[PDB]
Design a protein that fits this description.
GO cellular component, one term (chain C): basolateral plasma membrane
CATH topology of the largest domain in chain A: Transferase(Phosphotransferase), domain 1
CATH superfamily of the largest domain in chain A: Transferase(Phosphotransferase) domain 1
Structural class of chain A: alpha+beta
Cross-link (Glycyl lysine isopeptide (Lys-Gly) (interchain with G-Cter in ubiquitin)) (chain C): 17, 38, 51, 54, 211, 242, 252
Modified residues (N6-(2-hydroxyisobutyryl)lysine) (chain C): 46
Subcellular location (chain C): Cell membrane; Endoplasmic reticulum membrane; Golgi apparatus membrane; Nucleus membrane
Oligomer: homotetramer
Strand content of chain A: 5-15%
Binding site for ATP (chain C): 19-27, 46, 87-88, 152
CATH class of the largest domain in chain A: Mainly Alpha
Number of domains of chain A: 2
Bound molecules: the ligand */C=C/C(=O)N1CCC[C@@H](n2nc(-c3ccc(OCc4cccc(C)n4)c(Cl)c3)c3c(N)ncnc32)C1
Amino acid sequence: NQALLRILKETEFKKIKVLGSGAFGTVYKGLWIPEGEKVKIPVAIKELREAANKEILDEAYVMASVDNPHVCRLLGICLTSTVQLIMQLMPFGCLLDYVREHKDNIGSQYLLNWCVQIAKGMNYLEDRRLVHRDLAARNVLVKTPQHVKITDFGLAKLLKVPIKWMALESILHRIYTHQSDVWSYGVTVWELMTFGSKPYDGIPASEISSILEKGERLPQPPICTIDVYMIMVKCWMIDADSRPKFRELIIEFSKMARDPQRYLVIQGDERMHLPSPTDSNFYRALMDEEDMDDVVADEY
Amino acid sequence: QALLRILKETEFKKIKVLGSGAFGTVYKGLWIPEGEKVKIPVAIKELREANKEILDEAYVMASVDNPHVCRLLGICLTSTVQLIMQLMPFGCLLDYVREHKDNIGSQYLLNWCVQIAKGMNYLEDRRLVHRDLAARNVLVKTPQHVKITDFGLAKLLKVPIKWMALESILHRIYTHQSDVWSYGVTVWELMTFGSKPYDGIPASEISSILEKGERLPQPPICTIDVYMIMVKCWMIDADSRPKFRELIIEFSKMARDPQRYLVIQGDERMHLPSPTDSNFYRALMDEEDMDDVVDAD
Amino acid sequence: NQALLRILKETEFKKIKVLGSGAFGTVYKGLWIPEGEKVKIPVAIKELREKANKEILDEAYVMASVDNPHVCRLLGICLTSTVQLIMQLMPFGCLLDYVREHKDNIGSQYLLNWCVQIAKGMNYLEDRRLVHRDLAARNVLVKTPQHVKITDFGLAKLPIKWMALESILHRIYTHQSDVWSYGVTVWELMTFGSKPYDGIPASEISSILEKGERLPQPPICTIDVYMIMVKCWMIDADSRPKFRELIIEFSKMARDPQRYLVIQGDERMHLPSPTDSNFYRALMDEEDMDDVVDA
Amino acid sequence: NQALLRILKETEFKKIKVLGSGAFGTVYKGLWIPEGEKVKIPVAIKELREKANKEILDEAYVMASVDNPHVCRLLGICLTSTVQLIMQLMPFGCLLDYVREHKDNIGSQYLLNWCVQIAKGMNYLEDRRLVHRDLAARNVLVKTPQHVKITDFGLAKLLGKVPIKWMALESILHRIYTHQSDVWSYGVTVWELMTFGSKPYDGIPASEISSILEKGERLPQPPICTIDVYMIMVKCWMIDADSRPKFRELIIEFSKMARDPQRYLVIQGDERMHLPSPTDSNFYRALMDEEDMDDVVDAD
Ligand SMILES: */C=C/C(=O)N1CCC[C@@H](n2nc(-c3ccc(OCc4cccc(C)n4)c(Cl)c3)c3c(N)ncnc32)C1
Ligand SMILES: */C=C/C(=O)N1CCC[C@@H](n2nc(-c3ccc(OCc4cccc(C)n4)c(Cl)c3)c3c(N)ncnc32)C1
Ligand SMILES: */C=C\C(=O)N1CCC[C@@H](n2nc(-c3ccc(OCc4cccc(C)n4)c(Cl)c3)c3c(N)ncnc32)C1
Ligand SMILES: */C=C\C(=O)N1CCC[C@@H](n2nc(-c3ccc(OCc4cccc(C)n4)c(Cl)c3)c3c(N)ncnc32)C1
């Protein structure tokens, strides 16, 4: 439908503060003040740095379309010297910032659930036949810690290359496929379990293709179980078809979720607490009204 | 005509992504009747890939009227083709057995086998050839009531070489006797709790190996008496393979004494359905008349 | 008589290897050295699980007594703290084991022939009017692919799945009972060494026969072959075919092996030529015997 | 026989290297000097951690009495405050290590055969009435690529962390050891070989494992392992020992598979890697393997 995307007047919105920056565009926290109304509402706006707008509009129209709990939805667009994108605002920000910040605090149960939601969100993309082209811990967002959602997908299509994230087929031949996405998906999984460290740190981007060919893959994190790592390792496979399909990642991660403590070894995991039903429910009402699949602990 | 309903894209929506099938992508769905507040859960299959041709094939599928054959409720025609049928929460038997694999009854497994044959047999009666039959293609309306699906879908339009008969493989010949051979693979899938036949072996190799006689392994649970039935299905000469109609009786007889035929760890601990339990499932889950489940005599 | 059975001092023979463990006794590969002889000649020795020694000897004397192609004759007994039985070594060894190994590569003709061969041996035991009490595919030894010899017959002084209902119910052993034990043995061959009543507890065995739920019929087996097995297992001993009948039926069956037993790709795999077979007899089967039936 | 095993004076032999360490002992590569001879012969020395000396000799006498192609025999022992065990030294050493090194290029025909060979060695142990109590690939030596033998059997009884992952549940829970339990270890042994030396129940604490085995978890199908082979492993891991397969049955089942190895295991470039020619095998026999051994199953 063209119902999904809303055309926003520059008069309609103003940008109060800068949340973040991305290679594609700067981002803001914004107020949308409705025509004919008194109130001012918080929203997140990103304006592209460089910019066939009608061609883009066709792209945005799809971006608006997606309907998954774990996938971000593009509410609106504004066209000017610089294109403006309007979407829901996430206070928590990306997972990457969230995990790095919470490294001492974080516990086994959450990390796996996040992995599952990404798979769910990503799986929707595959069925929709959409290629994100950029899955990274940064790209994913937290509506709330329990609920996380994928984002910034198709932007490359809308319009500075992350070699360390990219799959070998991607690096060598500029080939992007859902399976390529897994390699990134694996990289993202590596990202969380490292609690925000940066892959292939200090290594020249140019050198990267050779190392993958050499088979010197990213090391497995101390917290990470070999069972979990092997899963990561599988994602990083030279042949894309060989790499696990998205569904499998959804199924396997969840099983771990049923028994989170055994798979991931985290200091003081037992002591740190997953949210109580009271804790999750409160968060849901205030922010997460949208009905999303209940998170799996199964042990507790 | 009366049997199959032609929907309007306005009429329903695929809300939840469901499953991946080589034949199709399956979506949980909601049906909104005009003038009505209510929404009805449906299963939607979207087919990857002549409008008239489907209708002839489609009408027959709407046609099937057996407890153990799923019927196609509606067809919606568009750049892509969507097949409407009732939603089964349990979905694949293959999914169900593997998920519940550690624990299952002898009684259930034989009963499914009996249930599958009754359905396959009916298709046989109707002169419908499945071409492709598998555990994956059989889904659970309810635990005691699995139903056979995707029948004849294969014929109309990745090939299941491991499932297929040698006669089917060698010259792409499909017959009811060819189906029977598949049934053993389906019977075999369950007794192994969801395993894969000729697992991981190349398809190219398989046609040669069947000739070599290197048949599927006997499952640990399986009694020889059960394994022999499968072996008969996989006989190279099609005609020699037992008819489903025979197949129904043998499993039904076995179901009378489930423990003697199939060996299970802690089966006694595991519970056959309570009569009360069976009735409760019927009331909400299953409202369709069907033959009664076999119970130990 | 005195001549038939040799009593050997422990000195005469030394065991070398454990081929297998019998339920009744352990079995070894042992070497026999003749007095003042450089040569060591291979034999197989059985040590009983472990009465009166004299009584046992009488039983051995009977066991020595049998001379038949399809029955095994005990050459030697050693009397000591533990009884030892010596009989000629067979490299193929167990019949039951042989089928399991060769199920993929085995021809139709051989299976029928073995059925005929056992039946004649069981029949000799019958004429002598001695009852085996324990016929098993395990207890038949392959002298050569074309020859088999039943053994472990008698051993009364010293299995439910094999055992006949009458024997199981009342500890009754009769020739008719031996036919029932024989019926299982055919199944084992046809099954290619399938374990009968696999996974089923022994306690269940008495009732199911009472129920009447039999051993299943093997895929290779023709309808005709299976029925013979079924006749053999019957509630009333008398109804079950005599061995002579079984010998006659099978041999008739052996004349046209293909019709009775259906084996995939049967034609390609065949019984060896007389020229080959002659080689087998001379090297191993020096013994006077019936030649194998040919279609 | 007394002759079979020889007591040795300290003076005759020395430990020139420490090859490896084991739960029982430290294994040293040592040379043996015969009196009045100018040359040294390589042997393998194992020293115990540290039961009267006479008591030990009786167990030891048994160890040196075992003649089988696939079961290792002990040449000599030295009585001391420490106890030293001497046996032939094989350059390939551990079978388990061999599999790890050779993952890149191990032929299908070999892997099935080692199973025949380990089983053959195991059956003899059963016939002899000896229960190994700690069978693992680690405990299987490689005399030659074609020929591998079983070692370290019966060592376990003398000592007083157990190898829990290998152990049958009966052993874990009630310290019960039987041939049937032994099959379970053999089953694990098959798993290690098939998976090219990967650790069993890796990353999982010992305490959980007895609990997990009851739950019904069993080690995963090796990626290169066909379903037929996996079932065989699975039976071994049965709770009811008696249902669990006997070795002779085990020997028979692998031999059939050996006839058509490619059918029962899938390895990349299995066609490329083929069993060594008779000329190649014959060469090996004479140089390091004079002793007679049972014929290898050949697919041809
Ligand atoms: C295959 C069944 C099994 O487990 N076996 C254990 C040893 C290997 C096989 N086997 N057994 C003998 C064998 C059988 C019987 C023997 O004497 C008993 C006996 C009873 C009644 C009459 C007579 C004359 N003997 C002996 Cl001594 C040995 C085997 C022989 N002899 N050769 C190869 N394999 C044998 C059965
Ligand atoms: C491979 C695991 C490991 O780390 N090892 C350390 C050295 C390399 C391997 N290995 N062990 C021996 C070995 C084993 C046992 C030995 O004597 C004990 C013993 C017990 C039971 C029977 C017998 C005959 N011996 C000795 Cl002395 C040595 C190796 C030998 N001998 N050669 C190469 N590698 C060996 C294990
Ligand atoms: C790691 C990212 C980070 O640290 N940021 C700083 C805080 C704000 C973060 N952020 N980005 C967006 C955001 C993302 C994407 C947006 O439009 C792109 C897009 C692409 C495809 C589909 C859709 C629906 N949108 C926009 Cl407009 C904004 C944030 C939002 N929206 N809210 C809160 N933080 C956001 C980046
Ligand atoms: C185990 C197979 C698998 O991976 N699946 C994906 C998950 C969902 C599973 N599943 N499939 C259907 C299903 C099957 C077939 C369907 O239509 C085909 C068809 C054609 C003609 C006639 C009939 C009767 N059917 C449809 Cl529409 C749906 C599921 C259903 N229906 N419910 C739950 N799970 C289902 C298979």
